[PDB]
């Protein structure tokens, strides 16, 4: 029971996702995309999970996204295929498309993987937190760097001036789809595999 | 970082394809066919791809065509089977049929593979560029020759009197189908596996 | 062609540098110094280079500075010797001297290497990006940290709140010189050896 | 003494090259470039060489370019450095620059090699003839392909409708330079290492 | 971290040296000479160096003298050769000549190494501090002794009645030259390789 004692937990949450009936450029093949990021706090705030944890540090070793259709949609009713892509930096925010795309916006990525609209998909990834760099050739701008291995660093749950360690955004997975003729609803389940370091007391009473 | 340094990229593009409801020779079995060819420029002009590449030469090692039904078509709704065939010369243009065929026009080909209309198909091939021969027994006519191995040659991206190296047409895959009782729409994804030779600057400023 | 697929490119740019005739403390030995830093954007904006790259992340493995005399300067015309030094943090900005130095301001550095003014120099180094630390004993001040191995991290090209990943400043090489009796002009060539991670599409259309 | 009997010859020619005094943008670093291509006829027409050869076919295994200063220019008078690049397709014609370049136009090439203006350079290469492709996605345009190995093909000296086999253009080497303060004249020597197949008679008398 | 803990540093300083145009005994060969000694304080006083060191003892293991021409002097311009000699006692003071020598005053020394006036020289040596002997056959006179190995002793930085440990003079290197037809200026760089013993606090406050 040393300072560096480690514990591993599995954490999950779910939510609904909708792909809307195509009402634009009807008759043409169009694509759109959305994305998911992972933060420990997103999971601790889910109703059935522990809302606080008594550990000093954490690191996310692995994340999982599974999206499967519901609402009575037929798995044998083909609606083409889109792609999933692992995008481990804040550029992923551009891949929630705000206009219709004439090509699959994710297919060109290295690591892009096909998925069929009518079956959903399942994918695991190593999501990355973004370390700050403030020394750029343009003054007062900043950029990011992330570490190749999760074993390199630890994130204090209550470190920093806001005690907001659990809100670090880890990137990330995006998914694209050809727009279908009818609306399709899905159940999405996210899973975190998180290591925690150092069991810790509550903050002192004041 | 020598003159002969090689890089390899994967490139993709997508489009919609329709097989129309049978409205001719109704009640009888008929077949039609279409085809696809591959040019690097086709892929670089696709919206999400780089539209120019800073390499001196290229060669297409492998191509992949995948066509899958969309528009709510049921995979368990059987509409017979047609064939794909690898046709590596410009004769393939005759296999976009302009009249109904009473037999499957591609089935006799060596290499012809069956595919079910309601499931689509996936096929990889080695598409071939066509070298010119102008010395024929008939005057003012030319013919073609293609090389067995992609490693034999290189196509300069900006070589030739038109600087149109990326537009060389590589042949090719055709697909046939028995005409269905209802229209079927598909999503088609093409993929190229391309080697590039010699990282290169932009053309000099003028 | 996985998420972690790596590509390696060599990139270069050039510019002119002048060491001015000595017009101060005439007859005495004085020294001055200047310095160079490395940012990917510096090289992509150079006219003959690709101005955007379709990769998700990068890291600079190695940099090279070569400065050689031009303008008819005689290599056999001895004008003494100064030093180069590898300075891998923003302290290097103090070594663009604004006053004449009575000693060589770089010679004391560990790693300082001699170079003859009339011949120029060539030096390779591992330039370092600067990670931010904001938790200091003095309020409202920040400091830097850099990683020993380039393999530890990745810089996303479009990551961070400014999408300015390519503008991260990597430090750095400084060079000093005894002031010569006549002006000397040089041609400087910088070279980067950069690994890129994950071929990527263009940003979606908006 | 069979049909496939081979003979190897070394062939050479020389000419003068001038790099002009900079008279534009004086005070700025600018670059220009030129290039050389290789054709057997260029060498057979040189005064001291045999103007016809009694062989049926040939192939160029190796070419060499050596350019060295003359006109009294001092090798110890430094005028910076440019680069040489092997460019084995007709794109090389763009690298005879018609406007001043702000960067070295050849340095980014894979295989680019530095050379000092005041010493000249020497470089060997495998120059390539350009095979015609007329089947492009744009009608009535053509492009090129070249073969990786010289051992793959033979060029008949008198083949084709013009009996102009010796005029096939083999590409190619380009060289760039920073513009110097005074004009520099050079002697350039080119060398071909050519294999010939099948000793042959003169054409019949008519 | 014991009493005997050793640290090793490299220290350097520079200065100008002139060999004057021959204005005496013109038309004849004459020689003059000068010398350098080494004291830690000489290097700590130099502007860019730390002016105090927090160590208890030191010893100089190795010294280096490098003198190279400047002022535009041509290296290919022959001005004869002189010699360097390692003179490890205070007799060296006699070898700053005050009258012209008709022979090279240092060439006879065992260890004398020639150097060309137009190229300068570089020499390493083990400089020696001088231990006092006061028991001589003549009253009120003293002499010197020095130790063969640097490992034999240690010099406390603040030892002795003047706390002037860093001012111990270590001998020494002399250089001779034939008097040239025109003045020649040089840049001289001296380097010390110093071991320090026992990291130490500041002197107590008073």
Author numbering:
A (entry chain E), B (entry chain B), C (entry chain B), D (entry chain E), E (entry chain D): 42 to 247
What text does the study give?
Here, we present three high-resolution X-ray crystallographic structures for distinct macromolecular assemblies of the capsid (Cap) protein from the beak and feather disease virus (BFDV), a circovirus infecting critically endangered parrots. These complexes include a 10 nm assembly, resolved at 2.0 Å and comprised of two face-to-face pentamers of the Cap molecules, and two 17 nm assemblies comprised of 60 Cap monomers in the absence and presence of ssDNA, determined to 2.5 and 2.3 Å resolution respectively in the same space group, arranged as 12 pentamers. Each Cap monomer was comprised of a canonical viral jelly roll built of two, four-stranded antiparallel β-sheets, with sheet one comprised of β-strands B, I, D, G, and the other sheet comprised of β-strands C, H, E, F.
The crystal structure of the second assembly identified in electron micrographs and infected tissue was resolved to 2.3 Å and comprised of sixty capsid molecules arranged as twelve pentamers. To determine the precise mechanism of DNA binding, we co-crystallized the BFDV-Cap protein in the presence of ssDNA labelled with AlexaFluor488 and AlexaFluor647. Crystals diffracting to 2.3 Å formed in the presence of labelled DNA were highly fluorescent, and displayed clear positive difference density corresponding to ssDNA. The capsid-DNA complex, modelled and refined to an R-factor/Free R-factor (R-work/Rfree) of 0.173 and 0.197, respectively, revealed an extensive array of electrostatic interactions with each ssDNA chain interacting with residues T49, R51, K102, L103, K105, K163, L165, Y234, Q236 of one Cap chain, K154, K155 of an adjacent chain within the pentamer, and F42, and R46 of an adjacent, inter-pentamer chain. That each ssDNA chain spans three Cap monomers, both within and across pentameric protomers is consistent with the increased stability observed in our assays. These DNA-binding residues are highly conserved in BFDV genomes. In total, 180 nucleotides are modelled on the interior surface of the capsid, and cryoEM data suggests that the remaining unmodelled ssDNA would occupy the interior of the virus capsid assembly, thus shielding the positively charged ARM domains. We found that in the presence of ssDNA, 60-mer particles were highly favoured with 10-mer complexes almost non-existent in electron micrographs. Once Cap is localized to the nucleus, the presence of the ssDNA viral genome favours the 60-mer assembly since the strong positively charged repulsive forces are neutralized by binding the ssDNA viral genome. Interestingly, the overall positive charge of the N-terminal Cap molecules in the 60-mer assembly (+1,960) is almost exactly equal to the ssDNA charge of the viral genome (∼2 kb ssDNA genome), creating a neutral and comparatively stable particle.
